[PDB]
Ligand binder design. Structure first.
Ligand SMILES: COc1cc(C=O)ccc1O
Length: 328
């Protein structure tokens, strides 16, 4: 069988929390008044929710209302408990209220409003300094939720909401987030395709916070190289092949051999043999102003096959890449 794995940090955070903290199935939802909020316009519809701009008529403030699609009670409770646990943390989206939507008959989560610009437009005007600044802000959120025993599991540009005017950032959509428990096996069907860690792609279930760091690395690569997404696979199998064409196949085999993992035999005729590439390969005259030795080394230390070998969020915040970022 597979060799077991443990997070190298925050390993027993939940072990020593009171059970109320992580036992979300037993959580009792405290409901607000649904008539406090008025839907103004629909912003989007995902697989698990519909998102609306709204007004809180008790203060005439703009808010965001996320009306959950019918889904098993524990997943709904999971997201709620996680949001309440993390509320007030650095750059964590603030859950303001929970109400029962009369039409859907499901919980509607009320969030603080973030005046966002579309990431595709934003990622295209971001300066070298902007990228470092916002990366640092994401790291604050990730070290926080990891230190609080939670992995996000869906880090991607769409879930990093940025108000570029006030240089304000929020990590959103905690619907896939989970509590980390040492040696627990998790569903590998998480994260968006382009941001899936190698551990998910090789069906290794005993993963941890370090998954989020691979996803963050994918975001970084897309930003500094101006290629979104960076690893652009057509499906989950091609996704691993795309990664192997950059990181190389010999380190992939070292990875799966270390945890005594076996690849899907489906890869036998599509994976091939590939050398590890140097990151300078992806540098050109249209992105070189976003690239530095510090950037490439930081990226290199995020994008590792071995989840145990990736920088932790805290380690990442110590990296020379962030030396130029103004501290508060
Ligand atoms: C799609 O999930 C979310 C969306 C938003 C705002 O767009 C805020 C919090 C969320 O969890």
């Amino acid at each position: 069988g597979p060799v077991p794995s443990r997070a190298r940090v925050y390993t027993d955070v939940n072990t020593h929390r009171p059970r109320e903290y992580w036992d979300y199935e037993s959580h009792v939802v405290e409901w607000g008044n649904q008539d406090d909020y008025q839907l103004v316009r629909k912003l989007g519809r995902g697989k698990y929710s519909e998102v609306f701009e709204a007004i809180n008529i008790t203060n005439n403030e703009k808010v965001v209302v996320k009306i959950l699609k019918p889904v098993k009670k524990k997943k709904i409770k999971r997201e709620i408990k996680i949001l309440e646990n993390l509320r007030g943390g650095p750059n964590i989206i603030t859950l303001a209220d929970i109400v029962k939507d009369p039409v859907s008959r499901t919980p509607a989560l009320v969030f603080e409003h973030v005046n966002n610009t579309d990431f595709k437009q934003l990622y295209q005007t971001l300066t070298d300094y902007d990228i470092r600044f916002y990366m640092y802000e994401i790291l604050k959120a990730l070290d926080y939720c990891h230190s609080m025993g939670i992995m996000h599991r869906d880090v991607k540009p769409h879930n990093v909401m940025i108000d570029h005017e006030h240089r304000k950032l929020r990590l959103i959509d905690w619907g896939l987030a989970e509590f980390y428990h040492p040696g627990q096996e998790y569903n590998v069907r998480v994260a968006s395709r382009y941001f899936k860690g190698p551990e998910l792609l090789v069906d290794y279930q005993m993963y941890d916070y370090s998954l989020d760091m691979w996803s963050l690395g994918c975001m970084l690569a897309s930003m500094i190289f101006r290629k979104e997404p960076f690893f652009h696979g057509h499906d989950n199998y091609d996704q691993l092949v795309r990664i192997a064409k950059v990181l190389g196949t010999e380190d992939l085999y070292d990875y799966i051999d270390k945890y005594n993992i076996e690849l899907d035999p489906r890869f036998n005729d599509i994976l091939g043999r590939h050398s590890r590439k140097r990151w300078e390969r992806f540098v050109h005259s249209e992105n070189q102003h976003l690239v530095s030795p510090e950037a490439l080394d930081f990226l290199d230390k995020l994008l590792r096959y071995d989840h145990q070998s990736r920088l932790t969020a805290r380690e990442a915040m110590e990296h020379p890449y962030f030396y130029t970022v103004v501290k508060d």
